[PDB]
Amino acid sequence: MYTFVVRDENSSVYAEVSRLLLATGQWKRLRKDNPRFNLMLGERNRLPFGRLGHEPGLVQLVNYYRGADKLCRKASLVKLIKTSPELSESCTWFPESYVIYPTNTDEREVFLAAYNRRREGREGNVWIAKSGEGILISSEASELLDFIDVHVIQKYLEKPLLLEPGHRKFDIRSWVLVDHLYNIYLYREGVLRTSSEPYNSANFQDKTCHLTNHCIQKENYGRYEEGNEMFFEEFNQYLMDALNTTLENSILLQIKHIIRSCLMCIEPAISTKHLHYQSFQLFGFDFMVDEELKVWLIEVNGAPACAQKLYAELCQGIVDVAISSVFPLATSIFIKLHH
Amino acid sequence: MRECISIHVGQAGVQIGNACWELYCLEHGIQPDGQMPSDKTIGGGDDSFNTFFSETGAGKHVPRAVFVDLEPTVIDEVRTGTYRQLFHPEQLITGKEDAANNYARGHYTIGKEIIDLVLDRIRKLADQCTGLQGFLVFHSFGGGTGSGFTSLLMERLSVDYGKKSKLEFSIYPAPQVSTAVVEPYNSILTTHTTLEHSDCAFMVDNEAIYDICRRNLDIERPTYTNLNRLISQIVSSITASLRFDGALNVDLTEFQTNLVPYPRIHFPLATYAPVISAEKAQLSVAEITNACFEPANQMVKCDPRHGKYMACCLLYRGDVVPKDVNAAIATIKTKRSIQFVDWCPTGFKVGINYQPPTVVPGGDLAKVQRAVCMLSNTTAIAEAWARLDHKFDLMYAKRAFVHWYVGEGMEEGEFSEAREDMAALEKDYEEVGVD
Amino acid sequence: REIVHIQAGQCGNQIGAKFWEVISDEHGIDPTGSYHGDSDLQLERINVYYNEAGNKYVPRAILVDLEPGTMDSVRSGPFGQIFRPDNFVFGQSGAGNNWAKGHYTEGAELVDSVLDVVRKESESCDCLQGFQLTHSLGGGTGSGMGTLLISKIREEYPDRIMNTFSVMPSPKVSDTVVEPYNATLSVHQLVENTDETYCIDNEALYDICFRTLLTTPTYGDLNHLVSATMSGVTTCLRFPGQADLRKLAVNMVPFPRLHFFMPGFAPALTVPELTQQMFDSKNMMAACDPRHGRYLTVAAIFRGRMSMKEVDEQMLNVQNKNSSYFVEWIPNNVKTAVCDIPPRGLKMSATFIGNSTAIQELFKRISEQFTAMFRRKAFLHWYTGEGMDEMEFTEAESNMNDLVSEYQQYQDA
Amino acid sequence: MEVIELNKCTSGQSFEVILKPPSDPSLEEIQKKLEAAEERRKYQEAELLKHLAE
Ligand SMILES: Nc1nc2c(ncn2[C@@H]2O[C@H](COP(=O)(O)OP(=O)(O)OP(=O)(O)O)[C@@H](O)[C@H]2O)c(=O)[nH]1
Ligand SMILES: Nc1ncnc2c1ncn2[C@@H]1O[C@H](COP(=O)(O)OP(=O)(O)CP(=O)(O)O)[C@@H](O)[C@H]1O
Ligand SMILES: CO[C@H]1C[C@H]2CC[C@@H](C1)N2c1c(-c2c(F)cc(F)cc2F)c(Cl)nc2ncnn12
Ligand SMILES: Nc1nc2c(ncn2[C@@H]2O[C@H](COP(=O)(O)OP(=O)(O)O)[C@@H](O)[C@H]2O)c(=O)[nH]1
Ligand SMILES: [Mg+2]
Ligand SMILES: [Mg+2]
Numbered sequence A: 001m002y003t004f005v006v007r008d009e010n011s012s013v014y015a016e017v018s019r020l021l022l023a024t025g026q027w028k029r030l031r032k033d034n035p036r037f038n039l040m041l042g043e044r045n046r047l048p049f050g051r052l053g054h055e056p057g058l059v060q061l062v063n064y065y066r067g068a069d070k071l072c073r074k075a076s077l078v079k080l081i082k083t084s085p086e087l088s089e090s091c092t093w094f095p096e097s098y099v100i101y102p103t104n105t106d107e108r109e110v111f112l113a114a115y116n117r118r119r120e121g122r123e124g125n126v127w128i129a130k131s132g133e134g135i136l137i138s139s140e141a142s143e144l145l146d147f148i149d150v151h152v153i154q155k156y157l158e159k160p161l162l163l164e165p166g167h168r169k170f171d172i173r174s175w176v177l178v179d180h181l182y183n184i185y186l187y188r189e190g191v192l193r194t195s196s197e198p199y200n201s202a203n204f205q206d207k208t209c210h211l212t213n214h215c216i217q218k219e220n221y222g223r224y225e226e227g228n229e230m231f232f233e234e235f236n237q238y239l240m241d242a243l244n245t246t247l248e249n250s251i252l253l254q255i256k257h258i259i260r261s262c263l264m265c266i267e268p269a270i271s272t273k274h275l276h277y278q279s280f281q282l283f284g285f286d287f288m289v290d291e292e293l294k295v296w297l298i299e300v301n302g303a304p305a306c307a308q309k310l311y312a313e314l315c316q317g318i319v320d321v322a323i324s325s326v327f328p329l330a331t332s333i334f335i336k337l338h339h
Numbered sequence B: 001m002r003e004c005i006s007i008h009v010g011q012a013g014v015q016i017g018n019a020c021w022e023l024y025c026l027e028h029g030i031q032p033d034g035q036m037p038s039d040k041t042i043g044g045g046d047d048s049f050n051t052f053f054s055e056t057g058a059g060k061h062v063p064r065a066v067f068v069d070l071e072p073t074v075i076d077e078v079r080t081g082t083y084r085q086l087f088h089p090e091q092l093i094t095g096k097e098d099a100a101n102n103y104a105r106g107h108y109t110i111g112k113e114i115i116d117l118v119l120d121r122i123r124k125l126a127d128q129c130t131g132l133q134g135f136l137v138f139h140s141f142g143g144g145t146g147s148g149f150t151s152l153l154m155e156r157l158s159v160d161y162g163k164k165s166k167l168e169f170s171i172y173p174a175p176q177v178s179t180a181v182v183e184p185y186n187s188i189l190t191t192h193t194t195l196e197h198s199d200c201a202f203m204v205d206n207e208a209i210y211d212i213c214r215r216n217l218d219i220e221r222p223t224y225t226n227l228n229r230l231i232s233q234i235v236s237s238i239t240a241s242l243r244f245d246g247a248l249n250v251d252l253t254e255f256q257t258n259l260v261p262y263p264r265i266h267f268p269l270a271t272y273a274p275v276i277s278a279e280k281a282q283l284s285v286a287e288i289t290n291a292c293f294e295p296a297n298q299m300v301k302c303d304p305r306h307g308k309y310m311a312c313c314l315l316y317r318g319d320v321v322p323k324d325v326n327a328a329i330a331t332i333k334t335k336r337s338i339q340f341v342d343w344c345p346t347g348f349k350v351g352i353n354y355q356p357p358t359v360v361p362g363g364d365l366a367k368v369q370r371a372v373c374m375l376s377n378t379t380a381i382a383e384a385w386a387r388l389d390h391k392f393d394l395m396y397a398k399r400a401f402v403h404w405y406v407g408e409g410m411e412e413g414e415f416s417e418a419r420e421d422m423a424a425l426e427k428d429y430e431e432v433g434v435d
Numbered sequence C: 001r002e003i004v005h006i007q008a009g010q011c012g013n014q015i016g017a018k019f020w021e022v023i024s025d026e027h028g029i030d031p032t033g034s035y036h037g038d039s040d041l042q043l044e045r046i047n048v049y050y051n052e053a054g055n056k057y058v059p060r061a062i063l064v065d066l067e068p069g070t071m072d073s074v075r076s077g078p079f080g081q082i083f084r085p086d087n088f089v090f091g092q093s094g095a096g097n098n099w100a101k102g103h104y105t106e107g108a109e110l111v112d113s114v115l116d117v118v119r120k121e122s123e124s125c126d127c128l129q130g131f132q133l134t135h136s137l138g139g140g141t142g143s144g145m146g147t148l149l150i151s152k153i154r155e156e157y158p159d160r161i162m163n164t165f166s167v168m169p170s171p172k173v174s175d176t177v178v179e180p181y182n183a184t185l186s187v188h189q190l191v192e193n194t195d196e197t198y199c200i201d202n203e204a205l206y207d208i209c210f211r212t213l214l215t216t217p218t219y220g221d222l223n224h225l226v227s228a229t230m231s232g233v234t235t236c237l238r239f240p241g242q243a244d245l246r247k248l249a250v251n252m253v254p255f256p257r258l259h260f261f262m263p264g265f266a267p268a269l270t271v272p273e274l275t276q277q278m279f280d281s282k283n284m285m286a287a288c289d290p291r292h293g294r295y296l297t298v299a300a301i302f303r304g305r306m307s308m309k310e311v312d313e314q315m316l317n318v319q320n321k322n323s324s325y326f327v328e329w330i331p332n333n334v335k336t337a338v339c340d341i342p343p344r345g346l347k348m349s350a351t352f353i354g355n356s357t358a359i360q361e362l363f364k365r366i367s368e369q370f371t372a373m374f375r376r377k378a379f380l381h382w383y384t385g386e387g388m389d390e391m392e393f394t395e396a397e398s399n400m401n402d403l404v405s406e407y408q409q410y411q412d413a
Numbered sequence D: 001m002e003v004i005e006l007n008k009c010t011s012g013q014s015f016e017v018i019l020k021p022p023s024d025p026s027l028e029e030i031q032k033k034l035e036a037a038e039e040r041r042k043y044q045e046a047e048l049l050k051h052l053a054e
């Protein structure tokens, strides 16, 4: 039988993973400080990877890839994409972004240079600053740079795809699981997190309409769809009925390509293929879709939460492919993205 | 010719010492009788191998080495072994009861009584030296003698020979081949005391060697003999630049100069390829060089990809030409995750000896045309400190076994004092390799 | 690395005699002291327990009792003639199952004669590592005089290791009414003056003989069981494995007072079977259930030709499947040694040595019998009649109760 | 991609590759600490022997 620990209680996904392992009967939960485990559901910060893989006669597995933070912090991702030969700045699917430091390694000057080339040509100059709180959408760099009070200034997508009825923008979230063999698995069920407010290009002040976070939106809500969560069957039907196309063709192909590009770029840096311990990890990818049905990467979440409807299925998927493949027990829900 | 004196302390140091000097004799064509047919200088000479061997009038070549253990079981084997006639009895020093895996007993209680005798024997060797470069110190981290007496000796050597350089070869404790529970204590205690006296320390983790022995030489339960035979190959590769004509690492001070930009961060990681079983029935320059960046070939299990380099040296033996090395480096520079500190250039110092690696007859390591040892100062080795410090913390929180140390005259304060220094060391590594 | 062996009282001498019977066979020595072995591996550490005389090997053993009975019995059956005749030290009074007599009165007049024999054996030791005593805590001589010997040996050899094989009172089987007094007073001494104490219980020894293993067991059967264990725990000391009493104690004893060990033995059985047996409660010789506490440390010794890679698999398996029973805060607290020479009649064997907090059950059991009698001062006059003060009883009781709570502290940590 | 300091000999050769540019206690103090520990031992043994004499 096998043993595991729980480093971070606040995790909704692995809280569910925890129960289903215990339920199998063949898994024992030791106390967090007990170093005689096979699986570690670790903390989000300063996880001690250095101590893993040194207990004799114990195959150890951890639910995080050391170094995956290169992808999952917004300053890191920008730096990664700009400097990686693989991305090669040949990333047409990532919004023009710049890394700015508060006056309190920086590219504030090149940002202004691009901002001004844009305003000479009368091209749309709306940008977004980020690092529910701490975001400002402005059509002018002065209003962007007095938020200087590490941040990322990113070109705002002024022509997003808007759902009808409602004239409302949305975000897509994909869940991706990478196992110990660095197989890339895409959860077939994504979710669209919707705005319940019609989009308005004249007013960026009222942020909620512009933003799609379930947090901000919470606070019309649930009028078009429940909890502003449209899943893939409905959205695919919408695309067919409204734009005479499918989710697979118009959007999913681009999503799979982006997921592949990101994870294959960092694979030689984080792979545990020839290590003394091994890693798997669940990621949440966030995308936005413009009106020409082009997909843009917004952010990668290293510690993602799931949608209530799907907490059951996804957490079972993790136990099956990511955990039981290392520690066997006594119509896949994943799409395998090959290399 | 500038001489080098080797000091082997405790069971681990002495037994590895045996393997090294056996291998040295094979590499130089010195026989167990001490005669060296190729050496036509007799009872004399300035040659490079003379840095490790002195010569008697009868043409006997004698190791510039001292063996010291607090009990006689291990060194008595040297006294009666195949290469027994190589050493003068002066050289082998034994006490009669050991330090019982107690740092305090080795450093204070027994160290005080045998330190003078040991220094006097070392002095005898130094007196035979025209120019003395320094010492090479072999010991375990976990033994009472290996930890406790070595740290005492290092302090005294700093006094007696202030100018001279000191290099350690240290055995990191591994539970698979260790019978002592208190090793974490002895390791951070000896590391604390010995830190400001060591110019460069090469750590070898028994866990790494054990695994390399099981998986590459297909040995189910390696013995010390197996582990030491392998360790001596790494040690030989490291010291070959002293015993042979070369221009890279010819004097002990080059090691610190080339590998250590910071005094406290003087623990280079070693990696060795190829390791192939004699049984089993080849690797190009680019292949063995690329192997050096594989965790499974490292003397310490850690992940350099998540650390920063400060220096890197490649030590080749056997057939290797410079253009091949440059080529291999270029292809690796592309594929693998190698990063250096901002204040250091991203470069390699390379040494090539034409003599291929030697192997003990009847051993497990098959002879290799080409072999390479990489020495890199990486912040990733700090993983080994954290591992060791954690085990320390677990026991010291309950003061487990602490009474054995206080009872030998140590203060509980020295425990915390040592632990604090280790904590500072960990931070030093973090500041340097993490952004 | 010489050890001096002392056996005291009837139980002490009977068990001690069987021990020398067993290891003499292992080192191939015959009842005259002559060596007739096939291997030179037998004599490489034979000095640890024997003196060389001359082509004859003599046990460095000292036999002690307050009555001549048991000593005569030792001298009668083989290997009775191997012992140095001037190492028999006996009186004539006996101790009448009275700890006070053994410790203070009858024992005190005999104790100097023992120390002279101890001193003469010690001077022919190139470097004495320490002493081992075999005795019982129930009676008067082994318990009372035995702990007196330990105290006086500690005074003259304060830097040497003192180990005991101590037979403790049984949960349900007793043949001495005043046993809780003798045991509690002994434990008080043991806690302070020994480095390691192996706890032996006769009921446990009997159940093993009666159930697992041989109907109608006798003391000879129980004594043979103890000897097998004693042979096992000392295998590393007299064969080529690195190692000595002090190194053993350093790794087995995290806290000075908590040095009471539960010994175990196993067993055509296989390795994996050996390993799961030696950890079983019914293989325990101290009638305490390891499942009622946690292991501070564990030493296992395997004897014979066997796959040592397989043995390490088995050792790790068992801990991993029972990590709840080992303390987390003592990393790698389970150790294993292997010796290639097997005990006689067995292809392979395994000896278990556990430092478990479960041993607190023994002392709290001793404590509850002691307090039952002492609260009514029952049979106390036989002890105060030899000069003892009641306060010495109160102190012994308090110390052992302290011992119990310390085991509980680390069991929960 | 530069190579420099190529020293060469019968035995072998050495050189450097660069891929990118950058951007004690006295004998008395030891004696004192060894003697202090010895004194703490002597003291502890003294207490034991006093305790035993009692
Ligand atoms: N690689 C290797 N490690 C060894 C050898 N001998 C012992 N060790 C390791 O060293 C530690 C024990 O220290 P020893 O060197 O045996 O101790 P010592 O220096 O003799 O110390 P005392 O015996 O306490 O006086 C354990 O971790 C062993 O695994 C050896 O021959 N080779
Ligand atoms: N360039 C851009 N153009 C238009 N909208 C953008 C944008 N960048 C971000 N957004 C909007 O910002 C919202 C939230 O941004 P973001 O996801 O970076 O915040 P966050 O990281 O705190 C939540 P999470 O971590 O779960 O993604 C998204 O719903 C998206 O609609
Ligand atoms: C109450 O009395 C106790 C002391 C004497 C007298 C009876 C018996 C028990 N006992 C024994 C036992 C014996 C036993 F049978 C069962 C047991 F659990 C533990 C033993 F030690 C043996 Cl094994 N050999 C004996 N020889 C002489 N007595 N004697
Ligand atoms: N295991 C064992 N126990 C014994 C033997 N002889 C006596 N005992 C037990 O020892 C206990 C009393 O201790 P004993 O040695 O006889 O008293 P002492 O002579 O004053 O030390 C009683 O329970 C006896 O049954 C024996 O040969 N073997
Ligand atoms: Mg976020
Ligand atoms: Mg030793």
Ligand SMILES: [Mg+2]
Binding pocket: C010, C139
């Ligand atoms: Mg009797």
